[PDB]
């Protein structure tokens with residue numbers, strides 16, 4: 001029953017590669033995903049205004065000439081005012097997006113970041129779960145967002161991919177509708 | 183900062199139930215990857231989904247109690263895809279037997295994606311356990327200006343930040 005190896009893993013092989021978690025890893029949290037961004041204006045506007053994330057915090061590194069922007073689906077009225085307080089909070093949020101701006105890249109017409117979906121491949125995308133793919137995407141269209149895959153294109157109806165201003169892919173999906181699609 | 187106007191306070195309420203569900207990474211060999219993320223890092227495999235017509239599988243991992251996972255495929259799928267902060271590891275069939283194939287981690291030419299990041303109670307003991315389990319480090323907690331902060335690598339070489347949120351605070 002181990003599959004032909006041009007056929008992928010059986011459930012058995014796969015599951016048997018899984019161990020229950022060591023109890024010292026309880027309380028571990030998947031806190032952030034870092035993406036490099038060419039232009040923090042385009043990017044902050046895309047993630048806050050279009051996608052509805054809240055800018056939790058900005059960190060500056062004047063020596064090393066770069067800034068970090070931390071965004072998440074969080075209530076602004078939860079963001080601490082105090083500096084240290086604010087940082088501990090931000091960095092204890094789950095499911096956060098860290099955007100790294102290297103100074104000057106916005107003026108560099110020669111410069112662009114690679115989105116991982118052409119050679120050499122790796123990272124693919126982040127994805128947002130929404131209650132209605134078609135209504136969200138209709139608004140995205142209204143707001144000038146660029147699409148990789150419209151919700152109705154292809155076999156997978158009801159799932160979409162849009163680009164952020166650096167070309168990074170963002171999946172848009174409805175958890176109550178995925179099982180129909182697959 | 184002249185990005186002063188770039189931050190839309192009060193997002194449109196149509197986005198109020200939006201949720202950052204997944205980060206997707208391509209993996210050469212899920213036997214290694216699954217072992218690493220579960221046994222070393224302590225995540226749980228939520229769901230394995232296969233696509234024969236398209237020759238790939240998806241492995242969703244998260245920090246979730248295995249006991250909360252519905253057993254039924256439709257209930258499971260709906261549950262998995264509504265969890266916050268999942269890793270979606272994509273396996274294109276055969277890459278584990280292709281001696282010439284490897285994925286790129288985004289941290290050298292051409293750059294883009296940098297890393298995912300895991301918050302822990304105690305960076306030092308986590309990293310000592312990591313050392314004991316033969317985990318490869320990109321940065322030990324005691325190298326450079328940033329002390330008490332580490333980066334490790336998964337089996338594909340993707341970078342994973344190991345931090346304590348109360349120590350960046352300093």
Ligand SMILES: CC1(C)[C@@H](O)CC[C@]2(C)[C@H]3C(=O)C=C4[C@@H]5C[C@@](C)(C(=O)O)CC[C@]5(C)CC[C@@]4(C)[C@]3(C)CC[C@@H]12
Nearest residue numbers: 036066100102289293296320321322325326327328333
């Ligand atoms: C151990 C030491 C002291 C040393 O061995 C040099 C390499 C390094 C491992 C180093 C690295 O390699 C890449 C980056 C990145 C550069 C940057 C701006 C980018 O490359 O885009 C993105 C942010 C990021 C993570 C900031 C921190 C550093 C400087 C990072 C981890 C700090 C720790 C550092």
Ligand SMILES: [Zn+2]
Nearest residue numbers: 034098299343
């Ligand atoms: Zn980071």
Ligand SMILES: [Zn+2]
Nearest residue numbers: 127171206270
């Ligand atoms: Zn995905």
